Design a protein around this ligand. Structure first.
Ligand code: 3BG
Ligand code: ATP
Ligand code: MG
Ligand code: MG
Length: 519
């Protein structure tokens, strides 16, 4: 059978609208999923929403809605967005779904029964502004009273923190320290880029791991602990187990779980890598479950001030971009302009340039010039490929194959912007091939009709290569290109058809009414 490949996004918190930062992760995951499907994997791609907690209670109440009314509306918007982006997710996990809650309940109860979790008191320091709790250890201007240790202000804002003490269950994660370090050693590529890992061990594991406060008593919107129902499961166990609950772990049908777990890649931005690289594998060990193969953290989309986030008032709505500039444009920009192991600032200027120059101009004009010439010189009848008949053809055919090879290396290493620039070098060279061969000159000489046909055949085959290579990235352009070229054989749309240049062995009638590929 096809090897399985399981990839996930984080589960986003719908306390406000999603922005291009969220779209970035989901489009990236989509490209990987689509690429892997084309490579012959049995793929499952998951995304979803983290729905519990006090903030959701608050948002719902201020809106005059129940928690579930509020959430249903938010999730409808999110699902619409992924539909609009043509995301190929196989499922969408909501933490309010029973399939999820049941796992949260069972995992918590199991860890209690095992003795990994025990009752105590959480002690933290809350800043209203930052919606963030801090430890005593990380407060700025720490105030003391004997002890103490009695107050201070946030390292982010400088706002005055307030003491929170409440009963909480603790997970003794430090027991697993040695096993976790052994795991890192056995799996050197578990944390990508490698930069992220060395921050993990130094900043967090060395001291190291404090018991993890895994429940709270101070809010009701969440999964209640069956054996102690005044406790609600806090974020750690609730949100993390989505990756296995969605697969029907501990349900009456665990077949997806038995197939796809462990995840091949968990994708995210850097601020949650620690949760996925430390807490998550430790929870899995406590559950005697295999660990994920790779945690991949991409960079941040920034604005002038700086990381894009709702609280900063600096967001760009992916709906607005898609509506104004088109889907291919929006997806192309996200994957080409930034990318993974780098942070990058969004600007509208860079967006329109990136997409006008590369898509409409380079690729769009290439396709339209080619089809126009086939209609003009051959009345629509594209001559079959024969061989490298022009003096430029041998080297260009070589370039086609090298393009595929380089592309593949880049895709395997998740360097999508490099993969894209490599495709564009080939698109650009194909436009140059028109300039160099001067088809119009060949069209004046009846003895050159065979050569003219050859030039046309090379243009179309080059275009076909680009189209196939772009299938993971662009969901509109490739299909449209095949349609206008009237390439119907589904095999000619797949990676295997790029192994030997010159696949088109029959005459084809291209469209007599070519129209712009973009937007
Ligand atoms: C699998 O994807 C994901 C998994 C996890 C762990 C993520 O990190 C989250 C999610 C989250 N979601 C909000 C939330 N609150 C909840 C309460 C109960 C139950 C669920 C809750 N969710 N919150 C936090 N926090 C809370 C605040 N905090 C401090 C120190 O003040 C620590 C980091 N960190 C994010 C994910 O994706 C974005
Ligand atoms: N600016 C961004 N750049 C890249 N990815 C982002 C960005 N913002 C959100 N994401 C994606 O969504 C996930 C959660 O982001 P983050 O922790 O910023 O939460 P948020 O939804 O912005 O809420 P908050 O209001 O707490 O910041 C990230 O790990 C990443 O997958
Ligand atoms: Mg497998
Ligand atoms: Mg944010």
């Amino acid at each position: 059978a096809k090897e399985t490949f399981y990839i996930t996004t984080p589960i986003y918190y719908p306390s406000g609208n999603l922005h291009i930062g969220h779209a970035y992760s989901t489009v990236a995951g989509d490209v990987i999923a689509r690429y892997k499907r084309m490579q012959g994997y049995d793929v499952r791609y998951l995304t979803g929403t983290d729905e519990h907690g006090q903030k959701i209670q608050e948002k719902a109440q201020k809106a005059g809605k129940t928690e579930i009314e509020y959430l249903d509306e938010m999730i409808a918007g999110i699902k619409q967005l992924w539909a609009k982006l043509e995301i190929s997710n196989d499922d969408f996990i909501r933490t309010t779904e029973e399939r999820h809650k049941h796992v949260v309940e069972q995992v918590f109860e199991r860890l209690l029964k095992q003795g990994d979790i025990y009752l105590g008191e959480y002690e933290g320091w809350y800043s209203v502004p930052d919606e963030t709790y801090y430890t005593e250890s990380q407060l700025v201007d720490p105030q003391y009273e004997n002890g103490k240790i009695i107050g201070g202000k946030s390292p982010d804002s400088g706002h005055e923190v307030e003491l929170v003490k409440e009963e909480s269950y603790f997970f003794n994660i430090s027991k697993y320290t040695d096993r976790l370090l052994e795991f890192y050693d056995q799996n050197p590529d578990f944390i990508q880029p490698p930069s992220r890992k060395n921050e993990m061990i130094n900043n967090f594991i060395k001291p190291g791991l404090a018991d993890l406060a895994v429940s709270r008593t101070s809010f009701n919107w969440g999964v209640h602990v069956p054996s102690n129902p005044k406790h609600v499961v806090y974020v750690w166990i609730d949100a993390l187990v989505n990756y296995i609950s969605a697969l029907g772990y501990l349900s009456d049908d665990e077949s997806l779980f038995n197939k796809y777990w462990p995840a091949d890649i968990h994708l995210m931005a850097k601020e949650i890598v620690r949760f996925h690289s430390i807490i998550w594998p430790i929870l899995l060990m406590a559950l005697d479950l295999p660990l994920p193969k790779k945690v991949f953290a991409h960079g941040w989309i920034l604005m002038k001030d700086g990381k894009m986030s709702k609280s900063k008032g600096n967001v760009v709505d992916p709906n607005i971009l898609i509506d104004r500039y088109g889907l291919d444009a929006t997806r192309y920009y996200l994957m080409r302009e930034l990318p993974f192991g780098s942070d990058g600032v969004f600007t509208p200027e860079a967006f329109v340039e990136r997409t006008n120059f590369d898509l409409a101009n380079d690729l769009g004009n290439l396709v339209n010039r080619t089809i126009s010439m086939v209609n003009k010189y051959f009345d629509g009848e594209l001559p079959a490929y024969q061989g490298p008949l022009h003096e430029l053809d041998e080297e260009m055919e070589a370039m086609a194959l090298e393009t595929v090879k380089s592309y593949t290396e880049s895709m395997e290493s998740l360097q999508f912007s490099v993969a894209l620039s490599t495709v564009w070098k080939f698109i650009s060279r194909t436009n140059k091939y028109i300039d160099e061969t001067t088809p119009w000159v060949l069209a004046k000489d009846d003895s050159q009709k065979d050569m003219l046909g050859n030039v046309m055949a090379h243009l179309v085959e080059n275009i076909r290569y680009a189209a196939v290579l772009l299938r993971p990235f662009l969901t509109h352009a490739p299909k449209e290109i095949f349609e206008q070229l009237n390439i119907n054989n589904p095999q000619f749309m797949e990676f295997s058809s790029l192994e030997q240049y010159g696949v088109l062995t029959e005459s084809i009638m291209v469209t007599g009414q070519p129209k712009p590929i973009f937007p």
